[PDB]
């Protein structure tokens, strides 16, 4: 892969990859994902148990690593660009938001004593968010603790609360949950603004500091 990369921010460290995925890839992934979609879950900050929460109202599913030719190419592309080996990557998570669905601002790094355990590949360091559709109204990735907020037209009010990224088909957002020294980066607070008009389909790669297993 090689495409235009737009530096979004340093705090947090955020980069937008233009045309990361082909339309054809985006379409394929949504199609495989549709039948398997269920309510998304979060982990309790203290316990690490996976639970249902008003916080997060998408549906999602998972693809195991290497279980599909199309996604395997993408997988390798994500390892290439992040410069972290495939062993450290969670499976592909596909998500859907529509009709008010959202994900309130949160951190991808774990607070709990279980989920950033050695067995689990240690802490989450970087996330790739691949937008599989272009969203008419809302569904921006918002980073409220960014150094620089967006303003003017074509951004929801939700999105003016931070630095924000309009979901566009084929684009991917890369951002770091950790500083280069491995400390938590609180500047990396992020969410998904309510999707108002449109079906927001995205895919994520949550990559750890160490091999999962």
């Amino acid at each position: 892969w090689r495409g235009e990369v737009v530096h979004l921010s340093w705090s947090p460290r955020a980069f937008l990859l233009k045309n990361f995925l082909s339309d054809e890839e985006c379409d394929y992934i949504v199609e495989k994902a549709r039948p398997k979609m269920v309510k998304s879950s979060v982990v309790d900050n203290e316990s690490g148990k996976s639970v249902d929460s008003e916080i997060r109202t998408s549906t999602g599913t998972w693809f195991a690593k290497g279980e599909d030719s199309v996604i395997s190419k993408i997988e390798k592309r994500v390892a290439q660009v992040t410069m972290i080996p495939l062993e450290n990557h969670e499976g592909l998570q596909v998500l859907h938001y529509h009709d008010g669905q959202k994900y309130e601002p949160h951190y991808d790094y774990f607070h709990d004593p279980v989920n950033a355990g050695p067995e689990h590949g240690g802490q989450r360091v970087v996330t790739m968010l691949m937008y599989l559709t272009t969203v008419e109204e809302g569904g921006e990735t918002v980073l409220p603790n960014a150094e620089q907020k967006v303003t003017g037209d074509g951004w929801s009010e939700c999105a003016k609360r931070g630095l924000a990224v309009k979901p566009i088909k084929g684009d991917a957002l890369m951002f770091y949950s950790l500083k280069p020294d491995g400390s938590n980066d609180p500047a990396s607070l992020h969410g998904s603004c309510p999707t108002l008009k449109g079906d927001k389909w995205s895919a994520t790669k949550w990559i750890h500091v160490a091999p999962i297993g």
């Binding site: 998304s40 982990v43 969670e90 998570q93 991808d108």
Partner: peptide, 6 residues
């Protein structure tokens, strides 16, 4: 909170 793992 954090998205549930793989």
């Amino acid at each position: 909170p954090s998205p549930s793992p793989s």
